[PDB]
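User: We ran a pulldown and think these components assemble together. Before we commit to crystallization trials, I'd like a predicted model of the whole complex to look at. Sequences follow.
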Amino acid sequence: DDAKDVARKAWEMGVSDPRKIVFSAKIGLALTIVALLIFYQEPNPDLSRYSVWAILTVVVVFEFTIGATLSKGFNRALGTLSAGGLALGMAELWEEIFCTLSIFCIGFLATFMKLYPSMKAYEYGFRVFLLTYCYILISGFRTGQFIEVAISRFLLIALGAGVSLGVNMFIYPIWAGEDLHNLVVKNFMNVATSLEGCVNGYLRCLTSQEESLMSFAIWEPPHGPYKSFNYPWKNYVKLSGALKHCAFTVMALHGCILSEIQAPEERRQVFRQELQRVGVEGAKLLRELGEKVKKMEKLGPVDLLFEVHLAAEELQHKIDKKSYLLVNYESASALSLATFASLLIEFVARLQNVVDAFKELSQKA
Amino acid sequence: DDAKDVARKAWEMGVSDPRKIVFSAKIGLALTIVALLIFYQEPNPDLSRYSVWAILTVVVVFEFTIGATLSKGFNRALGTLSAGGLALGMAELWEEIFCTLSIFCIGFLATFMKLYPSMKAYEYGFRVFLLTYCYILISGFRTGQFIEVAISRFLLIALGAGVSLGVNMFIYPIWAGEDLHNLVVKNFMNVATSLEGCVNGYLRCLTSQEESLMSFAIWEPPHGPYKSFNYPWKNYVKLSGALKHCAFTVMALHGCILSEIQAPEERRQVFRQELQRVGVEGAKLLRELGEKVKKMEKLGPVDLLFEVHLAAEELQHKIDKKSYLLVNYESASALSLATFASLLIEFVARLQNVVDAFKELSQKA
Ligand SMILES: CCCCCCCCCCCC(=O)OC[C@H](COP(=O)([O-])O)OC(=O)CCCCCCCCCCC
Ligand SMILES: CCCCCCCCCCCC(=O)OC[C@H](COP(=O)([O-])O)OC(=O)CCCCCCCCCCC
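Assistant: Here's a predicted model for the assembly, 730 residues in total across the polymer chains.
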């Protein structure tokens, strides 16, 4: 019952988003290739009980997006070497006291530098730095059994990363650039539906996830339609804030939807028809820009503000001749409708920055 | 230069927040005790090159808050056993094909169940389940060298967790309940400062982080002032949303601060004095509730709405006799001030739910 229903919902999510099955199958295939290689090409126990670092490196350095693998791994690459670099300094350097004090001070400094301000996301390298240094110190005591146990833990962790890179980079690439288009376009549609729902309701009564993907996207090679290196992936994040202004405005509109001083609807149903036209014509420019961005038409947004500007102006010179319903429990309701409509003209006025911010991007791209 | 300045800023942050130094020192002490114990009580190499699981368990199962350690570890506890539980089923169970198909299907199902909906936070147990099963399968091939290499990797990982629990639970406990008070009180003050800044500006011209802590807090024992088990840690999160309503309102106020249709200030400086009194008297009830929550006075919020209600009503019957500035480029500005003031009365009206939601909590506590 519950299991079947959950599986069904997951199935619709998977067919809607086919990346889930592909990514899971890719991880499965990488684990199978590593296990098969170990169990076939090494039946001779030169080393067959200390290779659990290959499975671990495969399961840890493999992520959803290609930019993630390349850029996040490079953080781990310098992170492992930095701890190793100081390790050689403190391996050659009466012995046990120095060992303990070093292993305590280095951990202290690493932890303090990892709990600092806005890097609470650049943190895997510091865990790497702690673990590498602790690993070297818990085992390097001998200098006779050093290399034999040390390189048997580096070669196998390197030839798990090689495969986890090749398989991920040459089977269904999940390029971070495309997901940026998917996020920047879905925003337009969902905001448009939000405005439509906002305006429909008074008459009905009887950049964290967008700039992180930019950091990933600066490392992925020019795929197909992204022509040259250093593609201007700086204006996709600047268009998002331009829309986020209007997102705040429509959020205020919804806060007006669910207010506690709502108007006496019989009174509101006098100025009741022009709002719908303003909303309908405002949704159109917002859907058309999304359509322009999705296929990336290099023809330009030529003067789309016309209909919405005319609608806004006609709304402006309609609130004014019929201003008898807005001014003089009872008094508070009157100004509410004025606050109600005064936001929408602000939406149209703010809609202009979006057009400029997309015209500059369509030229810079 | 840069290093000294960064260190200084970190020093002020640390003296302001002494938990950073304490937590880092505690991790350092745990690493030192583990390393000292290994290097002193085991100079005899029964096993001294395979205990790197003690250092790892210490560095991974140790977190900031006590509730984190106990509850997150329990997720790991059943996570490791669940994979181990099926492992015995698929160890007794012609051999290699079954091995590969099992290690692929189990990984597939675990990954799919980990990339599901709103658990993107309950995910460490699934990594644990993958790693345990892969570990067992990459090594259990022998059944003669099984136990010797297996228990030498369980005893040491258990007696790193024992110390990482004891040290964290009996040296400067960082109880999750107290941080809930700190977050629920800081909110009142910062929102009050936000309102004060909002109202000061038109005349100046010439629950993700609160409900997660609740889940942690349900596992920590009754410390001191929290009397009995099953303390009502359900109303601290319900008061936060009651304040979040007004947070949305003041966010709309700030959106009005930075609008593009701002009023011609010479015109606004006519109805200019009562807003300041309304804001000042509204900040007071908002600071006093924070003071009531901070020390948790069991005396009750007895009729604090009086001053703010009177201020709101006097504002109401002031917009109305002077309504000549609000109605009839020029027309749009007029209704702006009406939207301006119509929000504030909504703030006072919404302020009532907060008092009820805190009166019920002060009785239930
Ligand atoms: C060159 C490019 C490398 C690209 C990526 C290579 C590694 C990627 C790191 C991903 C996670 C990882 O491998 O862990 C580092 C391990 C210890 O971690 P764990 O296995 O305990 O989780 O620590 C170790 O593997 C031990 C190795 C320490 C010896 C390595 C340095 C030897 C001297 C190098 C100087 C050039
Ligand atoms: C009992 C309460 C325990 C409380 C916590 C104990 C462990 C806490 C887990 C924290 C992380 C951890 O230990 O990793 C699990 C390891 C493999 O992980 P890693 O060392 O590769 O990172 O996997 C292993 O350690 C291998 C152990 C597998 C044998 C354990 C099960 C044996 C049969 C148990 C049945 C009762």
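The radius of gyration of chain B is 30 Å. That may be worth checking against your pulldown data before setting up trials.

User: Thanks, that helps.
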